[PDB]
Amino acid sequence: DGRIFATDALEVAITFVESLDNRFMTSTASRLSTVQREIENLETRLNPNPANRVATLRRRISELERELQEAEAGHIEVLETHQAVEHIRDVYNLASSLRA
Amino acid sequence: MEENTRQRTENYISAKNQHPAWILLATRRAPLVLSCLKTLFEKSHD
């Protein structure tokens, strides 16, 4: 139509060039918690046995109840300055990965 | 087995000589074209 459109090769080259400069680290404490969470979620959602799923759901509910009970005492834990920065960067990386 | 080491080199050579991304990167004018294209496509995708 007389217009130019980018392809996957151009996107790959642009990604390489952009990653040449300073780029966000993925070898971080966060995105380790993320992979652990995703692995546990996949393990729960992949099992065919319903009893195992029920037991895992009950255990998660128990842990959430314990956390809520602790919070009721006022034990809500802010993460950190640097920890918050790292989590924000991790989330930004994960979100940016959605358009590849 | 060195096959994983010779077919790998063949694949790398083929990609270097054929894949548009590596061809553009190796081109001695790559920075100018890359900057122009990135600037053009940063604003519009239609």
Which chain B residues are closer than 8 Å to A16 by Cβ? 21, 25
CA atoms of A57 and A99, how far apart (whole Å):
33
Name the closest residue on chain A to residue B24, using Cα atoms: A13
* Contact by Cβ (8 Å): A15, B24: no
PDB resolution in Å? 3.0
Alpha-carbon distances of A16 from A9, A100, B9, rounded to whole Å: 11, 12, 21
Best mutation target among A14, A15, A16, A19 (most B Cβ atoms within 10 Å) is A14
Sign of dihedral through CA atoms B2, B6, B9, B14? negative
CA atoms of B40 and A58, how far apart (whole Å):
53
Question: Alpha helix locations (H) across chain A?
Answer: 8-20, 33-46, 50-72, 81-96
Cβ pairs bridging A and B (under 8 Å)? 27
Experimental method: cryo-EM
CA atoms of B37 and B33, how far apart (whole Å):
6
